[model samples]
Target: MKILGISGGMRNGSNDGMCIEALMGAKEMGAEVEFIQLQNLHIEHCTDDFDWLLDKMLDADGIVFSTPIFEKGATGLFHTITDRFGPRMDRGNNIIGTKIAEETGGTAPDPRILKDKVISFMSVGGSDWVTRTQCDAGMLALTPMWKVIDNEVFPWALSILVEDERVARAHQIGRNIAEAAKDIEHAQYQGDAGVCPHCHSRNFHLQDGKAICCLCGLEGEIHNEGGKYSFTFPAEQLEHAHDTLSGKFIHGNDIKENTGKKIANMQTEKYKARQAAYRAFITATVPE
Candidate 1:
């Protein structure tokens, strides 16, 4: 499961950083995730050639769209990025132009870009009592983006000239999106169609060409199909190095209780021989 977060603010330590941190907490919930800085991406804003950003959006199981209000509304960069998510594969433009964009900008985002996608937002503005007019304008600019993107906009009022609790609220919103993505991914892979050749848990998710268990984070190159009606005991699922991708295989033959050895023949073949590969795989253990 992957959640890709995108932020439109150009400032490095502003609300964007808060959202990114909260997103990290979501990953701690056992979901694989990625947080992207949208302003830094070299994506060509309103063009089909914005492959760099588009591919990121399409690849991840979840997405986080966020930004701070610039003049009175969303940052220009944010609007530019949304424009690039135009509907249709280029030849035809199903995405509404200015008409819809005007209605949706920061007041409420155009829901088309994020329908079916778990989307959220964080808004930030200078906090100065004298700037009440500016704050109202900022809210006007930011809310529409949330509306357009169909995000549950987090409420954060900047009463001072700097960010405070409101920033944290935004981050939490983004992180929440990450945790939800994992749930969606889990539901997507629980099919008999994804039976593991190894552990046989319905816990398999396919990416690229590899069918993997996003759970144990185990990845093996072999997706062998058990030839029609053949009986074979499953090989113990072992942790090689850290993961199968670590390339090196070494385990403690001193053997522990958790990772039991494999057995080919019941009488002659000892459990140790059966678990040779597994015993030779992991270097770590769980403490009792």
Candidate 2:
């Protein structure tokens, strides 16, 4: 099994070293491991050359993403890579794995290619509160990853403040990911792991007109009642879901459809009249 580690830090920091520690552990567990640092590249232009980037992600059986919390969330570059999975799915490819890769001939509707793949995450923070919440923020989006695997958080994550125990934890996370990937390669995931229909998390609060997926931010309205409870899925924002690839595909298709409709409408006489008044308001400028 091949395990890939991606560091989301934009500069030299504990997250960079921590991800390498984990990848070493995965290598020791008999998995081929590769590490990529997103900060080294021109991330804003990643999507312009996405096929190459997506190809790298698909080559692995397991993937680990490490990041430090920036204002309680993943760095913008982290989202840039993960966010493109759905759009790429529309073009007969995605970051998931081989099964759907075989089934959809790899396309938009089947967004969970990575569902069968193992995923793990690590987060670094300066405080306990940041450690838990910020680390979890990145983990919530890829729920299909092995449930038994735990994410790591290294608090007081500065290079000078790094502790030996935290480095050990990083190694353990890598080993766990590799072992799990081996199990998956051997067809070890038999029965489907129960997860929330909305958020795909087994752990949640289900009751009284609302089922809130604590892990995935899947807080929504509840309807079924009398004895227990159920939820009415409000899946408008796919990006907001914990496992967001599926939503990402839908979002891609929606954008294409809406964009086409707007263009078609704009060419019509009725729309042209509406636009006439605003034409004078439009102006163009170029740097000399």
Candidate 3:
């Protein structure tokens, strides 16, 4: 087994230390481990060195993501690197697109993308307030191919100073990922139960009487009994949760149908004139 640890912080900082500890735990489980410090790489542009990083991620059986929480979210470096792993790296969507292309005689996406992997998160932050509340934001980097273990968040800064307790937790996190990676077929979320059963995230988007998990897109209804409230998602919703392959297949078909219709409509003279007008409205500026 191979595990990759990504540290999105300054060298030797809390983020790096926690990530290294996690790797050590995985190593103890007989897994080969590699580490990547984002600060050491040049990635001013989204694509700069991203292909190389993506290849490393694709090669791993599991990954340990450790990042510093800044303000209410992860560091800018973490966002910059993960943003490049958009829909192109979405395993479920790639499978849908590839299957469609094969039947219609088009270029298929890379098969390497279909490789499954397990992942876990360790977020470190300086302030107790922001760290406790928003540390799980780092889990936004999660994708369909990854089966996540319980996440770890350190609200206190300077992980090296708190190495006694925090390091032990980080080690357990690493061992969990390594164990899950070894049994991909039966891997499950080992995190504490949350509002969203699909992704185990407490955050949700609510409208009217409906609710959707902000992280995994599981849809449900909000129930209010007297002064109490609860959320309930049916088994059908679970089966079609956005993180699942069946869900991606349905979404991909919808996009394909809608895009074809929109393209056909855009060919009309009226639409062509509207598009030209917008293009001629202003010239975007760029720094030299």
Candidate 4:
């Protein structure tokens, strides 16, 4: 098994220490491991470097994503990687792309992007004043291949300085991931169960008495009994959770249909004239 560690932390920082400890645990479990520090590489906007890094990830059986909390979220460096490899690399989108390519004689997406791999998250924060961590954001990186593997976002290992216990926890996290990598078919969620049954995220959005998992878009009803909250997601509801294959395909079709609609509407002379007028309304500025 090969486990890849991607750290979005300062060189030799506390977060990096945690990441290394985790990789060491994976190595102990007999998994070949590689570590990449984002700051050590040149990753710029609209560059091919992201693609090269993605290949390294694709080659691994599991990934340990470690990042420092910045303003209640993951660092920009990590976000850059995730943003660059968004839906375009998603396995669901790749399937849709393949269908389109087969029908239109276009190039199909790389199937490697769909390779199954387990992922675990580790995030550290400088403060303990707040209970929230960037672990959710770190875990969000798995969305592209979420349906292909069962994964976990290990509890956030928080501190400005590394604690011995946290280091041990990180080590355990590493071993767990390596084990999962070796037997993905039976890999289990290794962290505490959260509100969302699909992505295991505690975060949610409430609308019209319906609770929706913010990460996986799992919809359910929220109940309150004596000020204690509970949630229920029926099997029917979970069938369309964003983390499922059917759900992903539905989302992909929605996007395709929307794009088609917009393109058709834009083909009209009235829309073209209106668009040109809007484009000329402002003198856009750019850096040289």
Tens-digit lDDT track of model 2 for 1-288: 999888877555678788888899999999998888876655453444456655666677777778876655566666566565544432223443455656777644434443466667777766654523433443433433333354555666776225887788788888888888887655332222334554434445667666666655576755546754454466563455544556545545677799999999989999998778678778668799
| Model 2 stretches with alpha carbons more than 4 Å out | 10-12, 45-50, 90-115, 128-149, 159-161, 185-270, 273-276, 282-288
For model 4, the stretches where C-alpha displacement exceeds 4 angstroms are: 98-109, 128-142, 147-162
* TM-score (C-alpha) between model 3 and the true structure: 0.85
Name the weakest run of 10 consecutive residues (lDDT summed) in model 1: 141-150
Taking the candidates one at a time, how many backbone clashes does each contain?
Answer: 19, 5, 0, 0
**Best candidate, TM-score:** 4
Q: Model 1, 140-202: lDDT tens per residue?
A: 222212211223333334441245465555545545666566454332211122233332333
Candidate 2: lDDT of 14? 76
**Model 2: how far residue 19 lies from native, Å:** 0.4
After the best TM-score superposition of candidate 2, give how far the Cα of residue 212 lies from its true spot, in angstroms.
5.7
By summed lDDT, which 10 consecutive residues of candidate 3 come out lowest?
131-140
User: In candidate 3, which residue ranges exceed 4 Å CA deviation?
Assistant: 44-47, 97-109, 129-142, 158-160, 223-230, 279-281, 286-288
lDDT of 2 at 284: 69
Judged by whole-model lDDT over C-alpha atoms, candidate 4 comes out at 0.73
Per-residue CA lDDT of model 4 for 1-288, tens digit only, reads 999988888898776887788899999999999998877788886355676788888888898888776766666776676677665576677777788888999986787777777888776766542233433553455457542222223344445344676678888889998999998778877776665656666666899978987776778977779975666787887667676678878887888899999999989999999989989898789999
Sort the predicted structures by lDDT, highest score first. Answer: 3, 4, 2, 1
Ranking by TM-score: 4, 3, 2, 1
